[PDB]
Amino acid sequence: KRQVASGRAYIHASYNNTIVTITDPDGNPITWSSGGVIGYKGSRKGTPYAAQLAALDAAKKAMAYGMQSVDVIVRGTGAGREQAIRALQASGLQVKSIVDDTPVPHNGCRPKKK
Amino acid sequence: PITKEEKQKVIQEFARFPGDTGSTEVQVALLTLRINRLSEHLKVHKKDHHSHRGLLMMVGQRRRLLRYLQREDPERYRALIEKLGIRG
């Protein structure tokens, strides 16, 4: 909500789209971004370049709140998984640390058609 | 399972002489105990069926033993069936 130096950054990277969001050290988001906030539509939203622009825009929004350092956390295996990180490198924000945390079942929920 | 002591209490009773751990009647009674216990086991585990197969095979084995015993000598058979209370 308010203004903080340290914080976190989540990456929801699906196949049809990759979106990201910055948050306070607690868990409550400050601002966010996606392929859609870049104006792209369709498979253009899942594009790695779009993930780059989305992460850069998200960083640009985070810097407005005075964010400087951020612990990053990733999820999913979308075609923009690494580009979030890559954009967050020279984003102007301290990368501090990177963590994978892709949710995965121990076989329980039956999958869709595929 | 069954106790070793409980096993000996039977073996000693059915033996024709001490150390007869394998005689016909010995095996018949010995199997009959397991037939009874397993039968009672099925009386609460109706779902269980493999155990029930084992029961069928045990009963069959016992019946073969009774075949040979009855064929060899009907008198010792006459005593054994009476002491184990079968056929009816």
Binding site: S97, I98, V99, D100, D101 | -
Partner: protein
């Protein structure tokens, strides 16, 4: 790289509380490491993992820990 068995001497693999021995088997993910990396026998590996799950239930061992930087 390194076989896990050579790290420690003789020990109880059935013991489900010697966490300092059992921890060296799950890597930075909590994954029950494959037999080809721990270098154990079948009989050994099986009851090892079986006691491992027990240790997981007690809150001693972790089910799945988040991987670090990648």
């Amino acid at each position: 790289k390194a076989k896990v068995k050579a790290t420690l001497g003789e020990f109880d693999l059935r013991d489900y509380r010697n966490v300092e021995v059992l921890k060296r088997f799950l890597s930075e993910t909590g994954k029950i490491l494959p037999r080809r990396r721990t270098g154990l026998s079948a009989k050994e590996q099986r009851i090892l993992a079986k006691t491992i799950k027990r240790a997981r239930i007690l809150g001693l061992l972790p089910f799945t820990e988040k991987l670090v930087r990648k």
